[PDB]
Design a protein around this ligand. Sequence first.
Ligand SMILES: [Cl-]
Ligand SMILES: [Cl-]
Ligand SMILES: [Cl-]
Ligand SMILES: [Cl-]
Lengths: 178, 178, 178, 178
Amino acid sequence: VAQGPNGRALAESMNPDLLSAIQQHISIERYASVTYLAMSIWCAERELAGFYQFFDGEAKDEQSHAVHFTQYLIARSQSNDLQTLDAPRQNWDSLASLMATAFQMEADTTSSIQSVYALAERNSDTRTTVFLAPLIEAQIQSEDQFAYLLGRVKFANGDPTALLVIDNELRAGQTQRG
Amino acid sequence: VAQGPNGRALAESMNPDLLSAIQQHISIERYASVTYLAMSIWCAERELAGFYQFFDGEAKDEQSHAVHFTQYLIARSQSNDLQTLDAPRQNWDSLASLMATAFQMEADTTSSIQSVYALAERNSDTRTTVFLAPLIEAQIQSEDQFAYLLGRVKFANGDPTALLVIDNELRAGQTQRG
Amino acid sequence: VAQGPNGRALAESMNPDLLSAIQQHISIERYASVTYLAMSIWCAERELAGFYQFFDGEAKDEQSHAVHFTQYLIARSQSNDLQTLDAPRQNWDSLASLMATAFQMEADTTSSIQSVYALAERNSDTRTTVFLAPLIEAQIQSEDQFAYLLGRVKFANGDPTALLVIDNELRAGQTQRG
Amino acid sequence: VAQGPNGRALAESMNPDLLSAIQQHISIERYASVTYLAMSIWCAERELAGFYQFFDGEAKDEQSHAVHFTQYLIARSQSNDLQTLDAPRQNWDSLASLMATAFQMEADTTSSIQSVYALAERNSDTRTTVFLAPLIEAQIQSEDQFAYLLGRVKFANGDPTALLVIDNELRAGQTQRG
Ligand SMILES: [Cl-]
Ligand SMILES: [Cl-]
Ligand SMILES: [Cl-]
Ligand SMILES: [Cl-]
């Protein structure tokens, strides 16, 4: 029985480009997490308590997804490489603009998974494409959810009253179409 | 004991114009159902989640009413004839205009039942007029309900904040005067 | 952030041939639903109450699957296009022949999904192939189930006693190999 | 305040032809009841215990409906006139033929109500047409039920095994399409 790069028994070697692509995706999700934290703070600064709670939860959830990827690399007996994390964007002129960045961050997370998926398909690494499929399914729901929150916020058209109403929806856990 | 057109024992023959009128009404209710589905989608496209849930339920309910009519034709040993279903209207310039079409669709459903009622009265088919009476009673409540939703939406006068408030009412099941 | 054809924020554009293929599949499932309704009626006309209940449930379930596809198009910010629905087949010379049409309808539903799957694979639309995979899994079980019901009905070899026994199985919810 | 023919305070006079028609209908339902009793006995004589239980219940139910009409005449301050009751038919060559007579008896019960309904309509006695409407609704379900039992028995085509299976359905309370 061979040993993998992290030292555990190796079920099947992984192409080093696929390894790097996964390590990079872990960074994308760690960066989405700190971005949601910055958005949590920005909302809290403007007394948008529901939005603040929502993004606080999104930051923790996104970090869990990152950890889930590190566990997969351990499962494949591959080395992890936790990288330097850029500072997040921290300033926006409005909630609408903040939600636009949030939607883009979620969509870009899905894009990064798709790239890892396509690279694994090329290398015929079927464990990885299989492992990734539920994570892409969840990203579809996350994208639907952020499109919902962004569109609802844009519908408000900057009116504080509408934004307060939506803020209370979020504090109550009403965060998707349902 | 005679056999009816669908092959079951026949309690009492039905005039073929009355049969056709019932088969056509089944189509009206099937068409109301897919119309409510299209309205469900239109609302979902604009993040009006409460309205989306309401019309999703109305589509299923209207389909049940259609099925209820097919069971009556079976009870009378008459043949069913499920027809080609037109595509629904799918585009509206505003919620107010959508709710106007919804109200008209509900009122037109009642009109179609009334026509079947009047035709059965002419033919002295008392089973049918008796069978129809509870269904007209429910249509009165449905008309009251859609007049309520339409009028409330018009009262909002296109203000997004008011429409968000009404959207949340609908998501909570607050769909009539009560 | 770009807007998709239905007006919501767009996570990733979809090839218009893939869109049309999905809109067409929605029609196939809507048509399977009304076909199961017609079969429900045909069984009810012959006092096959268990078969009638089974197909009444299959019609509602198949409609739910259609709605599930419309929600996916909303999730992808694509336009829905609910189409004219053909009338279903409504006449069969025997239960065996009806069950044969039912099996073919279920198999053809799976074929239509496979075509959408293959088209999405060509366009590298990984959200769609991922979204479709559970639906194909369920179709395998549905095909196994209809092969079971069809084969059991053929085993009866037209004997009314055997068909009554199977009818009671279905009324009790005994609808698969288990 | 005037007194009616039975001596109670009279809310509204009833045409004597309408009174007689109601008194005659009471006899029809009393006769249906004893007919179901005779059918109960015929089934018991052939060890068809489920059919025997079913018709024993139908005899009691039909008698209750007769009593319900006598209460209406009391409510209208009209006289009751319980008439001589003919002997029921008591002999049949087969269950199929017995079920045919049962279906006809149920259909003839509905016809007699319809006649009373039409006579009340002519006399504009709206209490009576209103009172009768639920009873006609129930007759539609009774007709659907007896068409179901008759058709199922004919499907058996005289095979004892199939008739035993149906007998057990009835003993378990499986007496309609459901
Ligand atoms: Cl804003
Ligand atoms: Cl509006
Ligand atoms: Cl067969
Ligand atoms: Cl027989």
